[PDB]
Structure formats: C-alpha cells, structure tokens
Amino acid sequence: FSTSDQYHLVITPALILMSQFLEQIKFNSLKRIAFGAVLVRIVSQYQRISKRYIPEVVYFFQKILLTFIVEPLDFENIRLDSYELGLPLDVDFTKKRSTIIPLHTLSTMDTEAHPVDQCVSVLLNVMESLDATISTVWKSLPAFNEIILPIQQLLSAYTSKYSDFEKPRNILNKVEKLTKFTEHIPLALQNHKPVSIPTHAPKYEDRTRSEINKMKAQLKKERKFTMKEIRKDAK
Amino acid sequence: QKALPASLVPQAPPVLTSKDKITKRMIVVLAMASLETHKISDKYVLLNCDDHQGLLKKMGRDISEARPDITHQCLLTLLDSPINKAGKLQVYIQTSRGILIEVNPTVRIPRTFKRFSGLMVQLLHKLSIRSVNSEEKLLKVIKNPITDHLPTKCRKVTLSFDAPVIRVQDYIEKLDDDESICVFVGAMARGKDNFADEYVDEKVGLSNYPLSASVACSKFCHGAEDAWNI
Amino acid sequence: PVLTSKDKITKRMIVVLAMASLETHKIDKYVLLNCDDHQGLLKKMGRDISEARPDITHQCLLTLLDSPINKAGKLQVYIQTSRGILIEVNPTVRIPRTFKRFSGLMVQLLHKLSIRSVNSEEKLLKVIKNPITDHLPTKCRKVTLSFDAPVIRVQDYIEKLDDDESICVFVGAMARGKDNFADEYVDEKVGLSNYPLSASVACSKFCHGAEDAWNI
C-alpha cells in the first residue's frame, strides 16, 4: 500500500502494533534481538517511503547497543534485559564476514546455534539500518543533536572499547560533520499573524400589520377630514 | 532578559471613532465631494456625471463637476489600505452641501458603483445605516465643524499640487509622538485648492507631478504605514 | 521617450494581471459579462456568478495607470485574461474613469482586436498572443504576489534587483482563486503585508516602493 500518507486505514494500526512489538517485549534471546532488527528494517522501509521519525526506534537502538556491549557505570539508567550476552575482544572484523543476510525463517531457527559471527552480523546490519535512517531523517529533524547524543556517547565508548572496526568511526565522522554544518537556532515557533479589524455589511434598498397600519392611518385621516367639513357646514 | 506579556495571542485593537479623542490616529477626509440626491417623476437618484445630463443641464451645474466615481475609488482604497487592517484611521466626507459623514472603519463598501450610489442616497436620507449585527450604527452624520470632530492634538495639512514636495515618510516621522494627523484631500476633479485654508495650517506637496486623488491618498497612506512600522 | 516591448534592454517595471475576467456577449448588441448587470444569464450558461469582476479590473487599471511612475515612464502593463488573451497597455493612455465607458471601450476593443488613437500615430491597446516571455524584456525577475508567501520589503527588493535587471510582478485579478497560474513563468513568490490585501492596494503600494527606490 501507499505508506507515505499521514494516515492509512490499515498501515497506521500496523505501525502502532509493531511499535508495541518494538517496545514491550523483553530481550532475552538473540531470536528476539534479530526480530527487533528486522522490525527496524521494515520501519526503515516504511520511512524511506514515508519520511517520519520514531522515538521508540531510537530508544531501541540505544538499548541494542547497550545489550551487545553490556558484558556499566556509563549509563546505569537503561534497565537492560540481558547482561550475559556480551562480545569480548574476540571479533575478527573481517570484511568478508556475513552481511545483513536476510534468511528470515532460516535465521530464526538457527539463532540458538549462535556464533559470534552471527552476533557481529546482526550488530552490523542493525547499525547499517541506523546509519541509513540517520542520513534520511535526523539531520533534517531539528533536535538532531540531543536526539543522537546518547548514540554518540555509545559509539565513542565502543570505539575506545574496540578501536578495531571502521564503520563506528565512519558514523562518528558523519554525525560530527553534520552537527558542525547544523546551527540549531533557538525556538521561535510562537509568532502569529496579527488579527485585523472585524468588518460588516450595510443595509439599504408582516402584511397583516402593514395593512392594519395603513388602514388605521386612512381612518384617522378620514375622521379629521369629516370633523373639519361638518364644522365648516355648521358655521 | 525581559519577559513577554502574559498573553501574546492575536487580539484586534478596538475600532476608532469620534468618541475617542486621545489615542494617536489617522484622519482622512474626502472634501468637496460631488454628492446629492434629486427626484425624477417617481424616485430619488444620486447624481452621476455620465448618466444624468438633461436634468444636470436643467439644474445648471457641470457634467465635469458632478462625478462621485472619484469618491468611490478614493473611499475604497482608503478602506482597504493596509493601515485599516492595522486599525488606525477613519474617514470623514465633507459634502458639497456641507454635511459631515463620518465613516467608521468597520464598514465594507459595496464595490460596484450602482450599489455604492444606492448606499449614498440611502445615507443622505436616513442619515445612518446598521450592519449585520445592527448593534452599532455604521455610517454616521455629524455637524460642522470638523475641528470639533477631530482629535484634540493634531495637524492641519492639505495636499495641494502647488505646495512644495515633502517626503511623507520624512514629515510623519518628524511629527511628534501624541500628534495625530488629519489630511484634507481635495476630491474635486479639477480646479482650485483653496477651500480648507481656514482649517489648515499648511499646504503640502508630495511630488512635482499632478496626481489623481486616490493615488495621492495611496501615496500618503503608504508613507504613514512606513513610518508606523506595519 | 515611451517604453515598449520592442525595447528589452533598459531596467523597467512590468505589471501582469492574472486571468482577468474580460468576457464579451451579444444580446441586439454587445455587452460585458458583469456579475451584477445580470444573474440569470450567468446561471444560463451555468458559469459561476462570482467570477465576473470587470470592476476589479477597472480600479486596478485606474490606480496603476494613474500612479506617478506611469507618466514618469518606467513601466508597461500586461493582462492575461481568464480566456487566454494578452492585453498590452502602453504608458500613454488616458483611461476613462467611468466604468460604463470602460465597459464600452473594452467590448469595442475585444471586437476590433486593437485600439489606435485619433492621432493614430501608434496603437493603444494591443491584443496579442501567449506566451508572455516573448514580450518580457531580457533580464526580468518574475515575482508573484502570494498571500502565504513570506513578506518582503519593497525597497530592499529593488536594491537587490540588479542594475539593468527589469522587474515583473504577477497579481491575481481574480477575487477567489489559488496562485498556481504563473508558477511556470514566475521566478519566485512574495508576500507584502501580514494582512491579505486587495489587488489594487497591493499594486499601488508596490509601485510606490518602486518610485521610492528609483527616486521619483
């Protein structure tokens, strides 16, 4: 269907339902992690065609970075679901690794057979979607800076943690140059067109009561006249 | 550093009329206007230059004289000038016979000339008209003198061709703070500009060119908004 | 010196009227389509009553032609009527101020396809054909008055005009209607006051600003 519209009879209920899905579910399994990842990919589709923004999605990005590199004092304010699943200094970061590789049911069934390569693949796929969504949404959005600030903190922390990837610092440079280009003017929204002076229209050019008035005036005229004539007769 | 008024929502300033005699405002008058009602038998008609020539000759005046179109376009352009949408001016018609017609800034003129003429004749007879609300009278009629009907602290200037050119923006911006402005504008088609002399303090020019009355009104009005930051 | 479309070099003003209601009819002689001169006729051809405002056109023309910059000689007047006819007005016309004479002159123009004075040295009202840039001068900046378009200040716009850059304005002669008409032609849209205007008052204020800049 046509998703770019503001409201669609069935697309928007799907959006709120899948937002529910993004939000309330607990994150204990890499199955659910990849489930959120593909949920993100499909919202990214919906918004490369519709061009809006999702606070739940940016929250989910934050949460996913934190659950991947949970392995703590930096952000104790996140309430993750899994502390056990963490990636030590064992990543190969070889470019020939697995891509986003959508093998949807296949990935869902083989997820419990979880290699660090699969963890890296889902991580990279998610943050590629994150890069694309950033470059299509947030630099346009005004609050871009404070929107991405937790993302910048996570990315810098993960750089310090690993400093062996490339695409993290790639996104770092992208967002840094973007915020350098931006200006972030203070708000001036409340400004209104003065209301003018009200205007109006002028006026210009009951039959029962009308005929009553005319006949009564006639009668009064006649009574005066007959007075005067009888009086002259008498004199 | 300095807060804002408790409200800032848009709210229209109240209409200005002859009862308020304090706030600085703009007073435009159309003078010497050719406007009167005759009878033909069975009905009353306003004079117009183009259409009533046998009886215009019978009365003896000039076709070139008895023209109220000039009044119509002048009145329309004042009433729909931006300054009224800011709500700061009102107008006074000085009839050729001597009547004063004060035009409230809440009216909407009928734009076609026949409708306008109907309004003028109805006004000349009944002396007033009411609106859709009909809760306040729109077109009122008042006595000599205009000076008795003007804001207390004002100026007395008539826009005459012979008078030296002065830039309206300049002169208005020089005008003092509580100094309201009346301008006596000769609507009459062509002739002398020596009628309001006893009222006025000076004659003023805005160009080395002659002007149409409505255009002169537009220019002076324009300078007024340019001074008053609208 | 009188300006014309043949000279396309000097800096100047061009004023364009949009879809002006200039329509003719015959009853047994001719007549203008006046929304108030007749209503059953309007409903007879079924077209809307509230489109015929030859008055509106008339005072727009009166104000513009009587503006000082006119006989100061710095502009030309073009009108693209509702029916797709371009009307050229030179700076040398003493238009009758009367609307009835205006209507008679307009209908005889519509059926003569030209106006020449009794002097007859050169025409007066030129009935010519679309497009319009065929008669715009070379370096003309095209701007339409749009109510929702941001407000601008006429002087500053004139100084930001180039030295030889002529300037062309597009004003809608129609009371009701959206400003889509000359988007192909216009370079850009501007607003003039924060309270929406009359076409008459808009063109008047704009030409006064023009005179203010060009030291008239």
Partner: peptide, 10 residues
C-alpha cells in the same frame, strides 16, 4: 469572515 469579496445580493 469578510475579505476582498464585495457583498452578497437579494
């Protein structure tokens, strides 16, 4: 409610 639209009729 009224802006550059003339008047109604009867």
């Amino acid at each position: 409610t009224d802006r550059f639209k003339g008047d109604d009729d009867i």
